[PDB]
Point group: D2
Chain length 450, copies 4
């Protein structure tokens, strides 16, 4: 045993399940909002020898040693972050977060004291749990256990941010930080609006560029670097490895400076994390060079044009859509007026198009909508003529659930309907086969084999 | 643009630094204790297409969909983790989603302890990690010390072993809710049954950190903490020779007439998700499961027994050169040389051997901001098929390297001037070039796990 | 030296200032809302030998010994509390709080965990600080430091409790306890209203009977013992010594019981306090027997009739009045439409009628109204014909401040106006003399001498 | 109804119990340490018309109005407090609004410490109060332990003195923000300069509790803590022979070129109001100021020297009867008899002497839920013009009373049965009646401060 044997011959049991997943990602049209298909160039760096380097430290201030190469890869991800997200090196960025969720908790540990107060878009309102979600029976997110805070909702019959129930709940809550983060929100954030709301309440505003990372970088969608520190994930829209970073402003705000400088750096290490995943830091810096290319500018223009083409086709098929339309990479289809809901995701799962339940902007265990994300298959060189091609397959998939829902009542029986009916089982097996035949016809980033 | 281009031509600027570090890992003698060289089989799965699967959920309990195949790597990683440390699945459970060892430690705190509850951990300048609860005398630095109150338990400064007396004493005076038997820089073994008797007298949860001894415990090479602890956290890398991730081992099953249950299973699983993390790094989950099956093989046992034999040969050789080792010696994978009797501190050595391409780290010796010792790690080069005869050759290179720094200390005074002395002195740099190149010729001659090119 | 010498001969320096205060309390018409004049029978028990008894314990569960007499005085205050505030001994009461503020913090330590959440009427909205008041620069009340919580406001152009901004801010805050407490609020609390709001939000509702203690006891004003635990002070309206108590429901709410039982008893001791002020517990129990008398029923009917007579006379004099009128013991005069404000209290201070600034229901350092309390001089056998007699003296006092305000700008100069003008100094010296001559003509509870 | 009726005719039901307790205070030998008999001059001011003055504010900084005269009692109470303990007003300040000693202690915590900061205090079963931070091994009971984290510092169990070694040790391991030199049941004196060296090595605020030694310090009878402490809290009653209130003493004035200031003045004043309290109990503020001027007189010095002489005569007499005293003896106002060598616990004695009209309290002796000793207090009867010859007569009555309980223990077993034995046994009750009545004849013969009638 040497340690350089092939995965196919060292452990064929895992090689089995590795390329069975590569099959399913090519066999199916992944329309999950948070999902993307990383490039081979970044996937090669993700599984590189940089995993064998413990670099607990910082540029010039490392507690270890021998981090010669890792230092310049360290700063290059920073330089590429300042170049993919313009502005004078006036701005600083930290690239050590293990993912997007640790990036949000890090900024809280950096700027907020324990049990300090936050404002955040509720998870059933277009956010993730990192934004501060307590349930009415239990505290769910650690951002809600270590920091007390209250949800920030949007207009339930308009789909845009409710700035009336915002300044109201703000003056009555006086938090130290609010979040303008998006997980399921189809339009644009008014940055200048909430910035002065944050000084009326004396709060810092933080967003999540998780679903718009590449949209802001290619100047296709507006950026916060004149109206906001704000954190983001590496993947989803930037088409990279699983990591995260935190964008903080540096310099003056003698004049008063900006305090968002070394406390964020101190929060990710040595406060919350330890060894930087240097293989991920380099993998994403390859995708950070991807973000400075003209192809990425055209790819990003493709994802919005495709998200609007997906919407306009979804619009004509008889679907109501919260928000009114779309101005991002995502769709928030409202299926309740069409007799469908979010949970009855299982039907399209056995057809091999992966979606997710989404909180209905205004309903009452069963959600009422679902969330589709364009950039996943748009990375497969999809087009708008192929983006109304998707819609007929979603329209066909809805009709299978719409008919079995009329033949049942329970949903423990609705999902068992697709298993024992042996007639809908004929209809699903045939439906996925053409979805598999269609999905396999487009290129797929990454390795041909794994 | 297709997305399947080679890294060498898509970004030659990173291909530049990718094999320049692969050179430096072959170019240098990595003596860091926490560092290892992962296997090629795991690196292929680590940078696989499993990064393109968002599986926010749990095996069979996922809020998303299409998780048919991606689930099976999780449950197989579960079974392989319970098999690498010989735990029958009806008595023990394991969670394989922690992104690393630090999120794994904080997850157990959020799972069993309430905010501002009390923790006890070996102090960092005494052999512990930051996740164990380390405050400075001016500031709380680690998040385990901000969200949870904590107090250190130090060692006997003239014994080098964990003072298990000043632990049970101050525990009765502190009433903590969880104690850690976790080690980052300590050359001997933790008396787990001892810490078991302290943890049930005060009613506290006992957690260990197999971070530096995971594979030593996996090969049954050293006594295990899975019989004297309720929780056990570990890293997937370090001694286990895997990807950078973490695990959490919790006991399941049975613990008036009615029986006491076990509460850790569903509280730990809730802490890692949806409380603290989000998308599970499945590319790492599969990579560490690949190193988990290798870890159940007789080859991994032989490797782990070699790590001990090499760590003791490195220690016994350093002893004869006139060096001091706290605790007296070693029974694990690491050495903790005390450089104070040799007229040199921890930091100034760490710079000398760094520019010679022997990677060490400063370590604080019981006594005194600038340390006086270093931490040497066997499992890094033991994975390079090193032997004891090749591990006393390393020691002579360290002994020769110390004398280079020991002489510049006589020619300088400060340490802002000590580090620029080793750069411009065309005579000590000439002596450095011979030692650095000769270590390179020695280090480059050994095999290296992973891709030769990547 | 024996220890039984008279205060007049042992320390004449303090006897001087003791009977100079008894002069000023008789020489002036105390119209402070929180103020009352205690009876001699209770004042005698307040300075009794019960100060020399350390009774750290509880009925039958005392850690000390020899508390034979103090036990029956202990329970008698309880029995008199259950008799002055009817209902089956279904209800329990704790009589150890040192005052009213420690009573509120005790119920929080009893039912709430540290940093749990509260809802409370803001201090500038009719509450005290015990209700949870944070300033926009500093946390002021300890109820706001040990428990995070947010204010509960009222309708700013109606004066009644804003139940729209109540259920709104409630669902978005999900606290464990809300307060319905009054310090400056002229009307009645809808108890049944907020009780079900407290179960929609899953919160306990606590009030402060501080300004209505005797009004609820004589059945003149509605009680909470069917729609609420709720704490109160001993004095203000009950005309007793300075202490406090906490009223908690006992028994069932097998059936689920009420948890408000031994945790309140544990919070006042041994958690927050120590030695019970037994001299105060007995002094107030004398005033608790006062609350079961027909005279107290007629006295309480006098305070409301006088508060409405004071209002109706204040109404006709050209004063606007928030809330619309009055249904309690208090007045919340709105002086801004009359060119006066709250701060310009100094004028009537040198005239010897003591008032206090009150937060204007809707203004912008200088408040805009003041708070008068009827039960203070109503204890001096005042009448309604004597309660419009007050109004002309308040009307005259306003006109002194209204004219000097036109002759100055600053208020550091407005208060120095009444010192150096030597013409308004003639007008104030003459004004207080007839106020002193009028106030001295009525009986005064307590000792003739001290 | 006028409001000026006599208590005897307005409520004869309370006049019933008012002089029935005044009887019982003359009827019995009050041996409680914390208890004293307040002066008539203070009782007149305590139940004065100053209860009818709401003065939410501070001398010169009141948010209300008409506080002309009521202010002057405050500032005079300030001056008299600084004069009773010899503190020049430019170096020390005092706050006179705390309702008692417990709100005074928590006020200093809210003033200088943040929530969940750390406190150190002598454990309650070791000689401390609850305000010092006492948690049980199952529950946090005192509010000082819920809002602030804390840990006890115990005593040497075979010395009876405060272990100042296991204090500076565990302090370096605990990094507290404030330590207390406060005592509730400890017969010797606290080494303040010792606790001063521990409190500045860890940078912590040193606070004392003169609760049991306020008047002993006021008469300069025992060494004072006003030279080795930044804060000092005290009760107005107990040894100071005043009304039930509290005080807080903080240092003011001066503590690179620039000088260090003192931060306690405006932080302490803000904690007592408007943070924690509301209306100042001015009737108590004036009452304690009356006892504060008496405390600066040679009569109060003679009384305080007598409290020591009587406490030592009580101790030396108990020693000869075959009783044990922890610490060895006494140098303050209290005795801590250890009843375990006499075959009897703390609780069962406390019942016997209670029904004989000698008031004691159970006290836990270093060793073991049901104590084994009691706490005897001199200043209660020393205020009744007691002498040492009259304080060994008390001891013989305690010695005789113990033998009554020592024999019933041989005739019963439980303590639910021990307390009903002393009630229905027409033979031990006959022996109790002689001892109780003869203590009554002795106790009734001494003067009593306060009203004879009230
Ligand atoms: N066994 C063990 N366990 C582990 O876990 C471990 C290993 C190996 C790796 N690992 C895991 C990774 C270990 C990570 C780690 C460790 C310790 C500290 C720490 O705490 N050091 C302080 C000094 C740190 C300190 O003063 N920080 C100041 C900065 C002040 C400054 O920069 N300059 C001032 C200027 C003042 C003037 O103007 O005069 C000066 O001159 O001092 C602050 O934060 O404020 C100390 O050594 O005590 C740490 F942070 C981060 N082995
Ligand atoms: N030097 C000193 N300092 C002072 O400050 C001081 C003095 C003199 C006066 N002062 C100031 C006043 C002192 C105030 C003070 C003191 C101690 C405790 C305390 O903490 N005691 C616990 C037992 C207390 C305890 O178990 N409480 C249970 C109740 C459980 C129960 O009632 N029954 C169960 C049934 C179980 C079954 O069904 O089996 C049983 O049987 O045990 C709880 O709270 O849950 C102990 O002694 O350790 C205290 F609370 C309150 N002298």
């Amino acid at each position: 045993w040497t340690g350089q044997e092939s995965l196919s011959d060292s452990d064929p049991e895992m090689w089995e399940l590795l390329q069975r997943e590569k099959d399913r990602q090519c066999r199916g049209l992944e329309l999950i909002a948070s999902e993307n298909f990383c490039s081979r160039a970044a996937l090669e760096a993700l599984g590189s020898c940089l995993n064998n380097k413990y670099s607990e430290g910082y540029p010039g201030k490392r507690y270890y040693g021998g981090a010669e190469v890792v230092d310049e890869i360290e700063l290059l991800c920073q330089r590429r972050a300042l170049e993919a997200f313009d502005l004078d090196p006036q701005w600083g960025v930290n690239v050590q977060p293990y993912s997007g969720s640790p990036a949000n908790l890090a900024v809280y540990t950096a700027l907020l004291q324990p049990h300090d107060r936050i404002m955040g878009l509720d998870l059933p309102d277009g956010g993730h749990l990192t934004h501060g979600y307590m349930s009415d029976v239990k505290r769910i997110s650690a951002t809600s256990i270590f920091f007390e805070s209250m949800p920030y909702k949007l207009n339930p019959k308009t789909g845009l941010i409710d700035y009336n129930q915002l300044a109201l709940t703000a003056r009555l809550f006086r938090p130290r930080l609010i979040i303008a983060g998006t997980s399921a929100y189809a339009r644009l954030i008014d940055y200048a609006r909430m910035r002065e709301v944050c000084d009326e309440v004396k709060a810092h505003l933080l967003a999540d560029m998780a679903h718009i990372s590449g949209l802001v970088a290619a100047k296709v969608i507006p950026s916060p670097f004149k109206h906001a520190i704000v954190t983001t994930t590496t993947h989803k829209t930037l088409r990279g490895a699983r990591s995260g970073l935190i964008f903080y402003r540096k310099g003056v705000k003698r004049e008063i400076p900006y305090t968002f400088e070394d406390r964020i750096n101190f929060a990710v290490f040595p406060s919350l994390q330890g060894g930087p995943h240097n293989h991920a830091i380099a993998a994403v810096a390859v995708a950070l060079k991807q973000a400075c290319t003209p192809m990425f500018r055209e790819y990003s223009l493709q994802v919005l044009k495709n998200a609007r083409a997906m919407a306009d086709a979804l619009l004509e098929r008889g679907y109501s859509l919260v928000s009114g339309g779309t101005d991002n990479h995502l769709v928030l289809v409202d299926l309740r007026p069409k007799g469908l809901d979010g949970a009855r995701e299982r039907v399209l799962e056995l057809v091999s198009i992966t979606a997710n339940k989404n909180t209905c902007p205004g309903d009452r265990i069963t959600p009422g909508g679902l969330r589709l994300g364009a950039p996943a298959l748009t990375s497969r060189q999809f087009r708008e003529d192929d983006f109304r091609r998707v819609v007929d397959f979603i329209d066909e998939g809805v009709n299978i659930g719409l008919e079995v829902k009329s033949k049942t009542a329970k949903l423990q029986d609705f999902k068992s309907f697709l298993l024992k009916d042996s007639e809908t089982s004929q209809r699903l097996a045939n439906l996925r086969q053409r979805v598999e035949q269609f999905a396999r016809a487009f290129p797929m980033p990454g390795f041909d084999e794994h």
